[PDB]
């Protein structure tokens, strides 16, 4: 009475997360009747999982 049982259990888990966010805003105004105004912002956001 012989018995031979082989079990090969394998589990693999891998997870990667990366997020990049960059925001830059620049505004300049000069007046000397003369009036000048400039306003502009930029926003960038990215996320991957």
């Amino acid at each position: 009475y012989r018995v031979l049982f082989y079990v090969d259990s394998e589990k693999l888990k891998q997870n990667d997360f990366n997020s990049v966010e960059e925001k830059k805003c620049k505004s300049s105004g000069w007046h000397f009747v003369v009036k000048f105004s400039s306003h502009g912002c930029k926003e960038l956001e990215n996320a991957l999982k």
Binding site: H39, C41, E43, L44, A47, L48, K49
Partner: protein, 49 residues
């Protein structure tokens, strides 16, 4: 006289030998497979002037 499992048997003239044999051999094969795949992306962009 020929007895097999307490039963009276008679060997015919054509059969040479008929002997009981256990000879128990069973097989069982089980295989599993699983795969996971996930993808996520969300990009945000904003501009103002």
């Amino acid at each position: 006289p020929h007895y097999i499992l307490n039963t009276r048997f008679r060997k015919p003239y054509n059969v040479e030998s008929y002997t009981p044999q256990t000879q128990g051999k069973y097989e069982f094969i089980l295989k599993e497979y699983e795969s996971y795949s996930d993808f996520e992306r969300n990009v945000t962009e904003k501009m103002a002037s």
